[PDB]
Design a protein around this nucleic acid. Structure first.
Lengths: 348, 418, 334
DNA sequence: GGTGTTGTATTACGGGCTC
DNA sequence: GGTGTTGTATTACGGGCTC
DNA sequence: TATTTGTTG
DNA sequence: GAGCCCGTAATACAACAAAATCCAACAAATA
């Protein structure tokens, strides 16, 4: 994703669960990572405090009290796909840029912070159940002061300039003890911004080196069919977990295709290319029924099923030796005559 | 309350610091390393030590006397001055900008192997801890048999629930054991489906309760059947059956995509298709690895011959001997190819006696016990026997733990320090 | 007559520049790293070099051949062109915006390691200064607040005297005792101070704070009890309660505990009587406000969207009124 | 607009010696 | 005694042509 | 207006 | 060196790694 901005105008956040309760607090991981400086704040919370209505925004603002962002990158969680969250962020001038239906790699740096956080959480988690909510600010203060690898400087001193108390000033200069007159902070803080920016082009290059060696890009134009292979129907072992092809609508990125998996139902019809797969229909195939009487007689030539439309009474399914994505609508007037005993078996 | 407010005339760096002073040389026991280091310094030209008002240091970093080495690395590794128990890289980034310490990297990795919480908390890819070291290849046909099954499928009409597989280690011959997720009558169905061919020598399987099975094990001890019994949550040893159910899962999806809830009809077709299709590690169909009588014969294969083993009546001994020889060398080729493409990073661990190894909360606690952000503080266990090259039995300090065999993918040997 | 007016077809950048040329590959010994780098350029996405009349350059930076690396570092480090032997920060701020230089920071630090003229006695272990930044904080206590239907009848004021930053936050007046330092520690985003100069009343605390400092590495002692300076700061501490009273005057249900961080944001998002700038951009870049879009309530795709931004605008008007009243108070009093 | 990313043992490459 | 193992796109190496 | 039911960290 | 066709044929890379329940919580659908 885009490299950096002016001190966390780009930001990321994500949730992980499974944490043991202490005051009915079994979420406690709202980690917000200041992507430029990687300050990586995380504040204790719970599932039942809010669902982006009353109190979630309030500690979101007490985090944001130290500077409003300009870009969010988050997941498809229900706590951020709500209409209340998206509209308030739009009125705040801050984008959403959600994920792609179980593709957490969009939130990679927050999740990598969690991976660093989890080890330190186990280190500080001796009193697992009794009293340990004091350890998250301790883990924050330890993790921020520790130097990272991709930048060579601790994330605490990247943004704030100086290091925390008990100075252990290195052999570079006295410049890391910058706690003095503030009219000249802009020049050297911008110099450090240049340093960190250079370290992030180095980081982006390093990421693209060792990962693209085996990976092969997928190039699809709008109109061609595509399979989704997962995240379409949530006993998925022997049954056809992989579903039929859909028509792509919007090509957001080279690895981001928006497609019509169902008619108009729900939940953010864009799928990352990892689930997506090319479809090829090179092939005695039959023709396309368009008449009113051809939808009744040609109803025993079905192959698979998608489901039932939620808006009205119209079933979508696949026929045999026809255009796969271009389905033919079959209502109840031509549904009960054909044997439907073998139809709901693949839906259940 | 800062450090370095102390003079130390008795340490390793005394010989280095007397290159300017030349006054007092009060060396200690085992300080002959200082003499060798001073000799190496004398025969070279790397003099960069600065002597300024009791602060003896490197070009820009403070050299520390060896008396307070552990104090400094604990200070910059524990939370006394906000370390955090990180790896060698972050420890260097905390220490090497301020201190020099000849062979600092080796000292820091020694401290990482010394600090106990880093041993119990960190993982550092605990899936590459032993070599591959695969199973011994084979014997005559149908003597080694691999056993496992997937627990649950979408149920049929209420007579069949899950699929069990038997494939032999030599020929990889598919089988259709359709069970009900079973009772002590496992030996009935299992007997009816292997005894079609005959009794094996060893069973390569998991520690499953239908096979740990004290009633069933005594049957094997009486009959003359061994039992490898792969350890808790280590299904790699089952192998051929696991790879078959990998191939079976694709086949079962292919034959039951639109035909769920009646896949027991298609299961013999699944096994017959697996049987008729040649594999890669042997290059021949499992019929041809056995008595080669592919009955379908859609067309004759390459190097056209009689290809009718029904006509041969007494001469089958030489044919089976030839097939056995070529398939044995093909199994050895598969073994060495697997070992080459896997052991490029697999570091071995060979202890075999008298250590204090750990088990990092996998096969120690329950597989059904939830893994979470709860601390990983398994105690220092002990090892008393070398049960295999790739595992060590432990004295599990519990009631029984019902098993004490731990494959090397969970050990991460504990190291103490005086 | 200046640099870059010379042909150098045998260096590391040749493999990068032959992605479109593909003419000649006159490499040196042990130059298989350059072929690996060209393979890397082939299999990745960083191709943005512009190829025009021998000027091969990155999106805004002219690449330099590796042969004259010594010439470039001597030109931009020594006193050949009015230098001065600055640090790595100033040197990289001078060099990097103009030239691309793969592995530039390591080149600069390696030149610093292999130079001899600058390495003198520089002095010592730690900095000594009585004036700093986040190294001295003070706090006070307030009493009269609504229960907020959650017994949150207190406001915790924190002062950042070295930078005039503030932290106002709701607490309970019954027990501001271990829970006080818990929320203080989650407040501590900017490190421990040297001394805490609260000076409000008798304090039976700073014993468990002392035990915390013993358990930690900092010598932050809490002191200055029953002192009396009363020079300017007393006016600020007295006027601190005024903004909280204005926030009280808004409402009581879903009150100032909702959007009180926004009250702090546009409370310190204003210059202190034009003598000192805002605390956000006195330290950070700006901490942008971005209030530009506020009237789009036609569809929205009195407690969700509309009243929230009305309350934001009301808080902005309230802090403008408070700024006007404090500047007119200073005008009348002085 | 929207799509990985660092911590970590492990290992590879220059000054200085023997040539 | 007891502890991985093949299916699969993907890619690397010889006969025959131009040299 | 309560009880449902699609999908997703 | 330099590349190309074509025909085999090796080659790391990942899947079998127990299965399936909801938890909390957005928004559609009736009646």
């Amino acid at each position: 994703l885009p490299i950096a901005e002016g001190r966390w105008l780009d930001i990321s956040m994500d949730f992980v669960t499974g944490l043991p309760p202490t005051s009915n607090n079994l979420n406690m991981i709202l980690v917000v990572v200041d992507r430029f400086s990687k300050r990586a704040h995380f504040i204790a919370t719970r599932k039942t405090l809010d669902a982006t209505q009353l109190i979630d925004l309030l500690f979101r603002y007490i985090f944001s009290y130290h500077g409003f962002p300009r870009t969010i990158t988050s997941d498809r969680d229900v706590r951020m796909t709500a209409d209340k969250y998206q509209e308030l962020t739009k009125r705040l001038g801050i984008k959403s840029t959600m994920s792609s239906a179980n593709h957490p790699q969009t939130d990679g740096q927050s999740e990598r912070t969690i991976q660093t956080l989890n080890r330190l959480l186990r280190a500080y988690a001796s009193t697992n159940i009794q009293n340990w909510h004091v350890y998250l600010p301790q883990i924050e203060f330890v993790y921020n002061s520790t130097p990272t690898r991709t930048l060579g400087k601790s994330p605490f001193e990247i943004d704030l300039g100086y290091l925390p108390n008990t100075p252990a000033i290195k052999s570079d200069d006295e410049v890391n003890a910058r706690s003095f007159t503030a009219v000249e902070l802009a020049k050297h803080l911008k110099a450090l911004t240049i340093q960190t920016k250079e370290q992030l082009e180095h980081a982006q290059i390093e990421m693209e080196t060792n990962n693209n060696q085996r990976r092969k890009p997928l190039l699809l134009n709008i109109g061609d069919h595509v399979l989704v292979h997962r995240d379409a129907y949530f006993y998925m072992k022997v049954q056809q977990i992989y579903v039929g092809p859909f028509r792509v609508v919007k090509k957001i990125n080279d690895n981001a295709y928006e497609l019509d998996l169902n008619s108009h139902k729900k939940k953010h019809r864009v799928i990352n290319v990892q689930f997506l797969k090319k479809f090829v229909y090179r092939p005695y195939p039959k023709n396309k029924p368009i008449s009113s009487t051809e939808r009744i007689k040609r109803a025993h030539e079905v192959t698979a099923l998608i489901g039932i439309d939620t808006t009205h009474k119209t079933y979508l399914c696949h026929m045999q030796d026809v255009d796969p994505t271009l389905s033919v609508e079959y209502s109840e007037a031509e549904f009960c005559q054909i044997p439907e005993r073998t139809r709901r078996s693949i839906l259940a | 309350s800062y450090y370095k407010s102390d003079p130390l005339c008795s340490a390793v760096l005394i010989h280095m610091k007397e290159l300017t002073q030349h006054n007092v040389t009060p060396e200690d026991m085992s300080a002959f390393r200082s003499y060798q280091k001073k000799l190496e310094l004398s025969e070279t030209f790397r003099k960069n030590y600065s002597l300024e008002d009791e602060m003896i240091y490197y070009q820009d970093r403070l050299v520390v006397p060896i008396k307070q080495q552990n104090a400094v690395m604990r200070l910059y590794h524990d939370h006394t001055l906000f370390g955090g128990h990180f790896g060698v890289t972050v420890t260097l980034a905390k220490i090497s900008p301020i201190y020099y310490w000849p062979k600092l990297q080796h000292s820091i990795i020694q401290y990482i192997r010394t600090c106990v919480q880093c041993q119990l908390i960190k993982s550092h890819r605990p899936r590459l801890h032993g070599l591959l070291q695969p199973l011994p290849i084979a014997e005559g046909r149908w003597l080694d048999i691999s056993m496992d099954f997937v627990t649950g499928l979408p149920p049929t009409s209420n007579n069949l629930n899950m699929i069990l597989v038997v494939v032999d280690r030599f020929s990889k011959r598919a089988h259709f054991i359709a069970t009900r997720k079973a009772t002590q009558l496992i030996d009935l169905l299992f007997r009816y489906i292997f005894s079609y061919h005959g009794f094996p020598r060893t069973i390569t399987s998991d520690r499953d309760v239908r096979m740990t099975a004290d009633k069933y094990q005594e049957l094997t001890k009486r009959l003359g059947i061994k039992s490898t019994m792969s350890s808790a949550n280590h299904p790699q040893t089952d192998g051929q059956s696991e790879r078959t159910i990998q191939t079976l899962n694709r086949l079962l999806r292919a034959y039951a995509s639109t035909n769920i809830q009646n896949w027991h009809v298609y299961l013999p077709q699944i096994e017959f298709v697996y049987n008729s299709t040649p594999t890669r590690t042997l290059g021949k169909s499992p019929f041809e690895i056995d008595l080669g009588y592919l009955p379908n014969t859609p067309a004759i294969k390459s190097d056209d011959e009689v290809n009718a083993r029904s006509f041969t009546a007494v001469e089958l001994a030489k044919h089976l001997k030839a097939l056995t020889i070529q398939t044995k060398e093909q199994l050895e080729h598969a073994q060495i190819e697997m070992e080459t493409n896997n052991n490029q990073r697999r570091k071995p661990l060979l202890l075999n006696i008298g250590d204090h190894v750990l088990v990092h909360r996998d096969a120690y606690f329950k597989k059904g016990a939830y893994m979470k952000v709860q601390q990983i503080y398994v105690g220092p266990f002990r090892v008393v026997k070398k049960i295999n090259d790739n595992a060590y039995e432990l004295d599990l300090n519990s009631h029984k733990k019902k098993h004490r065999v731990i494959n090397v993918q969970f050990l991460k040997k504990f190291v103490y320090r005086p």
